[PDB]
Amino acid sequence: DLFSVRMRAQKNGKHVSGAERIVKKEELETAVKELLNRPKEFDFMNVKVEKVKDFEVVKFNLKISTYSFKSPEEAREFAVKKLTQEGIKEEVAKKAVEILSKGANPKGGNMRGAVLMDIETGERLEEDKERGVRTIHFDWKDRKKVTEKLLKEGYTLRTVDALALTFKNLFCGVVAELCWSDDPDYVTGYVSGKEIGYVRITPLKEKGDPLGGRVYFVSRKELSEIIECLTQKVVLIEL
Ligand SMILES: Nc1ncnc2c1ncn2[C@@H]1O[C@H](COP(=O)(O)CP(=O)(O)OP(=O)(O)O)[C@@H](O)[C@H]1O
Ligand SMILES: O=C(O)CCCCCC(=O)O
Numbered sequence: 163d164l165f166s167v168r169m170r171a172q173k174n175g176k177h178v179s180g181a182e183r184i185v186k187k188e189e190l191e192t193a194v195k196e197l198l199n200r201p202k203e204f205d206f207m208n209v210k211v212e213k214v215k216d217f218e219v220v221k222f223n224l225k226i227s228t229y230s231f232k233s234p235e236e237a238r239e240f241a242v243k244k245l246t247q248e249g250i251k252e253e254v255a256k257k258a259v260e261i262l263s264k265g266a267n268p269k270g271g272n273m274r275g276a277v278l279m280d281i282e283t284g285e286r287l288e289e290d291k292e293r294g295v296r297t298i299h300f301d302w303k304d305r306k307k308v309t310e311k312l313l314k315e316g317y318t319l320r321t322v323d324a325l326a327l328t329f330k331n332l333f334c335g336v337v338a339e340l341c342w343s344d345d346p347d348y349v350t351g352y353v354s355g356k357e358i359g360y361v362r363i364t365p366l367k368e369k370g371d372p373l374g375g376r377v378y379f380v381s382r383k384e385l386s387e388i389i390e391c392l393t394q395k396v397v398l399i400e401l
């Protein structure tokens with residue numbers, strides 16, 4: 163019996179922490195304990211525990227590579243460069259970067275989810291452009307093991323999380339992703355696809371800049387299934 167544990171937390175009506183864990187009955191309390199402890203400070207927290215009906219185990223198989231640069235301009239060019247290796251018009255890849263660096267949310271600032279960009283046109287396919295689409299119901303099959311492995315290999319807790327998220331995106335039919343954090347002090351971002359793997363790029367933004375985001379490069383003809391997979395398919399990723 164598998165359970166999805168989803169936590170969100172707020173201070174003063176602004177989102178401050180979030181996570182999901184998908185575990186067996188025997189590890190259910192451990193997981194709740196982790197997520198309860200997760201935010202340093204909050205005034206409202208919600209935890210949601212849901213029994214999993216169908217799910218699928220998938221084997222992780224992306225090559226990881228890191229790349230460093232003098233400035234964000236150089237970083238963002240390499241991002242575009244690498245995206246074209248997935249068959250994306252340079253104009254489209256450039257459009258994603260522009261969107262992210264300007265603030266993906268039309269109101270201003272950060273979306274809570276991702277832009278769904280049409281690979282051919284560059285058009286924003288998502289209906290709510292403030293909220294975007296959120297990739298949920300996924301986790302490492304054995305997170306203890308993955309976490310110790312990836313940390314002493316050099317990578318960070320963000321990497322651990324971002325790896326699992328993207329892998330699900332790519333599995334769900336997303337052709338490629340552009341992403342960088344919105345935390346103003348973490349300036350390593352990435353670009354990923356089945357061909358290029360997971361490609362870490364520092365620095366993808368200036369230090370102290372609080373804007374970040376995700377763009378999923380999707381084929382329009384597949385939009386529905388992709389949105390369905392992203393939001394609903396339960397996926398456990400195995401190393
Ligand atoms: N589950 C998800 N699905 C799709 N996009 C997401 C996402 N979580 C975050 N994003 C996008 O990625 C950008 C950066 O978020 P991150 O820095 O990776 C995690 P976070 O901002 O700390 O939220 P968290 O507190 O839930 O972890 C956000 O601006 C948002 O656009
Ligand atoms: O792989 C890394 O080390 C960079 C993590 C990607 C940053 C994404 C995020 O934190 O939102």
Ligand SMILES: [Mg+2]
Binds near residue numbers: 343344345
């Ligand atoms: Mg953050």
